[PDB]
Amino acid sequence: EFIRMYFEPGHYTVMENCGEFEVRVVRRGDISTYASVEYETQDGTASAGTDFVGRKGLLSFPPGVDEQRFRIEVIDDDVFEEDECFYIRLFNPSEGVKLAVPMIATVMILDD
Numbered sequence: 079e080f081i082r083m084y085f086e087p088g089h090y091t092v093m094e095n096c097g098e099f100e101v102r103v104v105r106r107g108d109i110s111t112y113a114s115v116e117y118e119t120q121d122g123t124a125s126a127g128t129d130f131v132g133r134k135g136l137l138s139f140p141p142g143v144d145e146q147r148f149r150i151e152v153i154d155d156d157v158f159e160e161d162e163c164f165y166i167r168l169f170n171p172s173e174g175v176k177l178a179v180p181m182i183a184t185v186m187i188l189d190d
């Protein structure tokens with residue numbers, strides 16, 4: 079491998095009423111060709127369908143581009159909740175790419 083991919087930022091703290099927030103994944107090393115990686119949300123103490131909307135996707139990095147950004151929807155309610163967390167993981171990197179820490183992003187939702 080001559081390409082590494084990882085979340086940057088690796089950690090996101092978001093308010094419950096933010097609507098959506100943006101996650102960023104970076105590529106380091108060989109720029110010069112197309113590369114890709116998949117991601118998927120996963121529950122922590124926060125859960126898809128109650129606290130955020132579950133999402134999986136494919137991130138495409140054209141030649142010359144070293145980052146991709148995607149949005150995640152946070153579900154707002156009126157009920158008081160303690161700080162809760164969910165995660166987003168990278169998987170299935172394209173040929174010649176190796177994931178690097180952090181390859182799981184942490185998301186903490188703060189209640190409003």
Ligand SMILES: [Ca+2]
Nearest residue numbers: 094155156190
């Ligand atoms: Ca709220």
Ligand SMILES: [Ca+2]
Nearest residue numbers: 155156157158
């Ligand atoms: Ca709430």
